[PDB]
Amino acid sequence: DQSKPWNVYRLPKTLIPDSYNVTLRPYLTPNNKGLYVFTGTNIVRFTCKESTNIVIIHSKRLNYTSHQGHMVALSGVGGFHPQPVIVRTELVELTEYLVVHLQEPLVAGRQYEMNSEFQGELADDLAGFYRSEYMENGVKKVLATTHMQATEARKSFPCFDEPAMKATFNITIIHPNNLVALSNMLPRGPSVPFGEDPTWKVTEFETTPIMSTYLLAYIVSEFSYVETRAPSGVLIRIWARPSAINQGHGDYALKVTGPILDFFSQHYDTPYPLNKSDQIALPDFNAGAMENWGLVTYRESALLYDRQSSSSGNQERVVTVIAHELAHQWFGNLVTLEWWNDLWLNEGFASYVEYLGADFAEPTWNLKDLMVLNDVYRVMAVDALASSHPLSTPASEINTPAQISEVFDSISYSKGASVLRMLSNFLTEDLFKMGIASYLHTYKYGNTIYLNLWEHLQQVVDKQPTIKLPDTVSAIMDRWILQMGFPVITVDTQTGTISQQHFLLDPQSVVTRPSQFNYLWIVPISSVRSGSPQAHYWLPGVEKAQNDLFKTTANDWVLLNLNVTGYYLVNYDNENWKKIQTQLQTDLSVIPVINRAQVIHDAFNLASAQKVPVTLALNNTLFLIQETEYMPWQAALSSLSYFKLMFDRSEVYGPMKRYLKKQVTPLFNHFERVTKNWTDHPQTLMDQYSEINAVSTACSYGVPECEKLAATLFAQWKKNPQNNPIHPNLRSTVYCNAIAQGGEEEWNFVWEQFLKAELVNEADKLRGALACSNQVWILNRFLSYTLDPNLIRKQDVTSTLSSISSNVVGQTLVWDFVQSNWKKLFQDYGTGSFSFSNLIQAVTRRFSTEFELQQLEQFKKNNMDTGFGSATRALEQALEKTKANLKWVKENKDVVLRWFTENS
Amino acid sequence: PWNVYRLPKTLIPDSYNVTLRPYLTPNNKGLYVFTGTNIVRFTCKESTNIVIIHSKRLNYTSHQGHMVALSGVGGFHPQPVIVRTELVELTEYLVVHLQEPLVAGRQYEMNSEFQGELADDLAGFYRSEYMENGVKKVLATTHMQATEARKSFPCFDEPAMKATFNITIIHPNNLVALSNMLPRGPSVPFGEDPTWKVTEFETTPIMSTYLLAYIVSEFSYVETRAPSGVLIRIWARPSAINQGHGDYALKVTGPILDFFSQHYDTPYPLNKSDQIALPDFNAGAMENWGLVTYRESALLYDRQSSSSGNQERVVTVIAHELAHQWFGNLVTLEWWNDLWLNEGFASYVEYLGADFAEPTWNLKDLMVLNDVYRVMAVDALASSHPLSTPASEINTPAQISEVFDSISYSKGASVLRMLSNFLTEDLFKMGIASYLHTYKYGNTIYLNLWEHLQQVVDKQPTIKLPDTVSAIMDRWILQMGFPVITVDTQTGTISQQHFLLDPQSVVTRPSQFNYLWIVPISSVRSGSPQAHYWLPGVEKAQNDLFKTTANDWVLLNLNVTGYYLVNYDNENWKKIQTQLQTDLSVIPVINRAQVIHDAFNLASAQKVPVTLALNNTLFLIQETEYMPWQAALSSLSYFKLMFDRSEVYGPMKRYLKKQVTPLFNHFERVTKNWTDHPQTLMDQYSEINAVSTACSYGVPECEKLAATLFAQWKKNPQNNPIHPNLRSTVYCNAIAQGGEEEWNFVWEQFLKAELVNEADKLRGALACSNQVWILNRFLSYTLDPNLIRKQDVTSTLSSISSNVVGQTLVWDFVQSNWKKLFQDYGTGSFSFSNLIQAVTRRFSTEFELQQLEQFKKNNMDTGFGSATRALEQALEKTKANLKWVKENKDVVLRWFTENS
């Protein structure tokens, strides 16, 4: 009954919390029933802003101890009549409410305190207050940890669990005397014994700042740490398993965390306000990392680093994730989204700002350039769908916890970053950061919506003469924030005519989301004419214009969007494309490296949408035979992976592989020479990445010299496994190829190494390579292990299922397994973020036939009893993509076959 | 009446004149067609104002306002008056509506002028094609069985409506026409066009429509005369005849025909028996009286390139078709529900004929593996059917087509083998001879047979039965299934019960005998024979023949002559197991196959623990005979289907590898490094299973043999160094361990392969690829009749499906291409039901059962045609498989692991 306030998914605006006291006691040994439990009490102090006879507060999977026949007690602060009288308390499970029914309405303007006493499960579900486990020598260790985002604080204590209901939190932790408690703040004093039980201690923490419930954290463990003070005086500690800390696996995080934090404080003119910032690595963690204010939590694989055994890509991951989480200390913690429909205000800012902090940390890596591959091109695939969504989705469309979990997606993260990058570029970053500092000073300890940003940027633009815009910030940026998608910008170099239209992967798909701007953008457009920079141009919100900047003669070409600073694709007339192709084949260095990736990426996007012939995208890969840079090869491999997914079960695959083998063999041989036969690996991060791509691609497509290298390294490893001779950058390729080329013996050896792998970086590589078996029975045995948490942690299941489905033989096995174990998978991941939508996308990627479309529709019908939870949009996108795939394969299978045959 | 599938009995034909003219080039509509005329002469037995006659996909040239003409033969008072004629497509009728009833006792002639397609559909009058040098050659040929004669001319197309047939063929002057009989004279030029000739054939004997045949081709022949004087000719593509590929069939055909004439004291009545090999043919072979048609793979034989199994196939199929000249042609089933009267006899008698031609091979013993154990898997289901199925269940052409199945063929053979054993063969054949003499040129019911058998039994004193022949044989004919005979050796208690693969299959088919049989039971005690015993039609009995002491074991059903399973108390099983480990030679080789086969069936159906069945395979490490290894590999193929996608498969492979490696080494020694293969057919077969099994389960020196032999062949393709007996394994294993290069080489060899024996081995090996993209590309080729002939599609699909990577690839393909496959095979025999069984046999999970049910109801508008029972059997088996895997996966993993 949606007329009742306790049956709708937004809290009343009538009661506003001020502060919370929460006391928690985890029990880290199971009870007589085999459960791990925690007990707690809390006090919520709120103000009645508007008269009401009910208290609606969030509560999820908590059992309450009743006091006077009621689940809570309630009183006005400091006596004052009338005192409230509870008629009854009820739990409403669907909307995750505790409802307190009062005999009289509360008094507007007064304060009340509600006391509860509760019990919950320290489950292995990675949500709320939960448990994490690890082996140390012989012993199974169990610890207690939290993850509140988005809607899980209510699972550890009753609270007004929405991000705009900020409060202060007074945390007390009751814990065994041999364990340490951590929280957002420092303890108020030394821990004293629990009077009721001296084998237990009590640790009480300083009051948090005004903050959102989803940012609370508390942890009880045996962990150790390493410690430094940042130049600013902020205390930095890196916490982890004692084995990890003693091996130095926390040292790299300790190196970069304090400097990045201080960089952000200075760069945005807003000092980090707390006295410390703990980073802690958890063995069981759903997301990867979480920005809890003062106590940032990480997957081990995102915080720990072994300078002998972790790869270069592992190290990039650590500094990027740390920079991301520290960026949240401003964008999310100090200033917070008003509601989850504006998630990009937190996640888009943090995903853009991570590159400035991580580039500060590791300037020689040139990390900023990877933003095009890692974010822009990551999200453009889904943002070309009619079933995408805008950065700022209308709020009443992101209501339920499943829909909230859903929007933690590539739009909110990576399109968020892409649009802020573009804004920063055309404003200049020095101007951008002044507007942001204004934004942050105005809204600190409060909440914002998309509009509040643009005033502060407009003022800095208006107060200086150099940088000017053809419109207001709000006119330009609203078009990027309130409507989904992005334009393709098409140039006729014979007339200079320039036009825009909403880019749709399937031109026959029906866009039903209306746009007040009719899917037109105001587009900033940089360009070069045969390498020479041109005047900057803005395309106004018009379908078509003309400018001689984009007209050429027979000896000149133009190239739009240098460095792909703007969030759009570019298409040209056929003659311009030919001139670009000739330049790439004559002297590729004339085209900047990012734009070499652009002409590959955009042509393949355009081909899949019937806007260029598929042979033009393929012709754009010919020059790779002389390219040694990482990014253009990575763009080609990512584009061609759509071809792999569409064709690796068909007659096209043979000719495909022979083409890729031909294109990559000189790159493989180039690295064999410059690394002196794989003994002296390259110096720059980019060249190391290019080397890894050369080795992975050469081995995947049958370069016998790469197959020899992998076989030889693996055979050497297996002769003495206490010494690993495989460079970590090469391990995934070597492990995968040894399993692919071998049988049960190689699989079992790798599985044994996995079971004893102490370092998660190494375990991850071993686990991934196990998906490379060509034996159905071995893949299905592997699949059975994923349902055993003694073998595969819950946090790794979805990643493992994805890797197995990437295997062409595992495609049908994982599809069948997901369908056969649906109910378990839905319970485990259906209300969480990332994993379940990742899984739906991974298992359906290949679908391209009428039969497979019908089977996906049947799958949807078979599971209407559960629905699709946090993968509901993902399933609609999978349907749209499958329909597009089916038509594209039918229209291009024969031309693609012919092209690979002729250019091989 | 025209809406019911059986003909009325009011009008009975006497004779037919049919003139057919095939056009072997397409017409202005792009079709290959034949034109024809016929005259059907029949007698009105009962007055009726309608003529209902069969007609299928024939277009008529009307005359005088009607689609046929109807004359009275000497009628003259009122000649019949046609009001209306119509075609009724569903029941495949042409219906003539008359103004007045036809007159009881008068004779009438119906005259028709028609056209039909010479389609590539392998049914009726159809076309077949082959390449010769560069030229595509097209010939016209027939296959009428069961209900396709109606697709070549209107006729009363039921087998008890026998008639004589006067065939005329108008054909191009460079081609020869053949039919059942010899021509009445030299061909004469077609007056209207002298590039065509006219060949008219002698009148056939009184016979069924489904046995008529006529062929127009450029084929060559070799010729001989049987010692009895019957002319024998073997016809095939000229290239094949010129290379000698018809010579082996020329050697054996005449002698086998004469053997049957003598053995049943009933002379073949025609002056010739042509055998002809067709490039496109659905069944394998067909017994048309005087003109027996064959797949090339069932008749042709190359001394240098065909294998030993290929040669056994030829002599056995020839013997089967010649057996039909008696069992089907001379005497014919009354209706298709009693098909076993034709093919049960043929499938049993083929062994006597083949044994006569090749007495050193010992082919009679192979009937236990090839027929008894083949059918026992299906006959252990609630969805089986009796040998004599109630006629109303066998009504439509789809139901008729489906009943050409392992029950009618292999249980029919098994039951008549039983009968021939417990009364002797010499007595059996005298009773058959009586039966044949009495009902020649007519049709029979099972009850006609028992009488003639009873007469011969009653004429001698030495063979005595516990009841009449009809009483005994009714239990094996009229109710489905077979008993498991259980022996408690501690007490001599012997009991019977209907054997059911899943104890919760719900038997809804009632039997008037309550599923009890009268069972002939042979036995030995520690190797030496006991007296014979008959278990009466009772659930339970006691006899000391089956009571033993601590130092004695018994064994029932010597050489598995009887159609039943045997189970014992655990103590007897252990003693039999000890005997196999002490001296396996004491248990006759066929019963060594029995103890493996029956235990595995018993294990699947809860009557023994699965570890008993697995323990009965332990002695194979010392066995070198073909038959017990073949029984084990056939029983274990169920374990492979159930487990080759699970953790169980690793240990199961390690166990098979252990058991077979000394047999492989044994053949590596006795063949002198694979240069001198065994002299005996049985030992050749044992060698083939050793190599195949060793390579399949990873004996590294078998893998080495195959890859080396294949590479050497590929280097020098004009010189094949692989002995034909080993090609299937070597080709498959080299494909499995190689990639596109190996696959593409085998495919081009296949496309150019002239000898179907060799094409078949190449084609089967292409299913061994472990590359999804290669298997899917292969699947796409099966839709192109320039690449895979229609006669080979379901074979290829089944082969790909057997590949564990091919399992879901074929399942998806069949569902996706349902419409064409249903059209091509859904109303014919063998192919469609084989396909359904093949693609589903792995199903063992709830999810797979749900997909099967969804498949059924996605197609219930079409139905499943001649795979309708097959689908119900697949549903029953899948449900049994789910429970069986649930109940046994852990014990089976443990046993394979512990036994290495």
UniProtKB/Swiss-Prot annotation, chain A:
Q: Name the catalysed reactions.
A: Release of an N-terminal amino acid, Xaa-|-Yaa- from a peptide, amide or arylamide. Xaa is preferably Ala, but may be most amino acids including Pro (slow action). When a terminal hydrophobic residue is followed by a prolyl residue, the two may be released as an intact Xaa-Pro dipeptide
- Note the SS bond partners: C699-C706, C736-C772
Q: Which UniProt keywords apply?
A: Aminopeptidase, Angiogenesis, Cell membrane, Developmental protein, Differentiation, Disulfide bond, Glycoprotein, Host cell receptor for virus entry, Host-virus interaction, Hydrolase, Membrane, Metal-binding, Metalloprotease, Protease, Receptor, Signal-anchor, Sulfation, Transmembrane, Transmembrane helix, Zinc
Q: Which residues carry this modification: Sulfotyrosine?
A: Y112, Y355
As to how many cofactors bind and how, the note says: Binds 1 zinc ion per subunit.
Could you tell me where this protein is found in the cell? Cell membrane
Please list the residues that make up the active site: E325
Region Interaction with FCoV and TGEV spike glycoprotein: list its residue ranges: 607-777
Q: Which family does it belong to?
A: Belongs to the peptidase M1 family.
According to the record's subunit comment, the protein's assembly and interactions are:
Homodimer. Interacts with SLC6A19.
Function summary: Broad specificity aminopeptidase which plays a role in the final digestion of peptides generated from hydrolysis of proteins by gastric and pancreatic proteases. Also involved in the processing of various peptides including peptide hormones, such as angiotensin III and IV, neuropeptides, and chemokines. May also be involved the cleavage of peptides bound to major histocompatibility complex class II molecules of antigen presenting cells. May have a role in angiogenesis and promote cholesterol crystallization. (Microbial infection) In case of feline coronavirus (FCoV) infection, serves as a receptor for FCoV spike glycoprotein. It is as well a receptor for other serogroup I coronaviruses, like canine coronavirus (CCoV), porcine transmissible gastroenteritis virus (TGEV), and human coronavirus 229E (HCoV-229E). Also serves as a receptor for infectious bronchitis virus (IBV, Arkansas 99 serotype) in serogroup III.
Which protein, by its recorded name, is this? Aminopeptidase N
Organism lineage: Eukaryota, Metazoa, Chordata, Craniata, Vertebrata
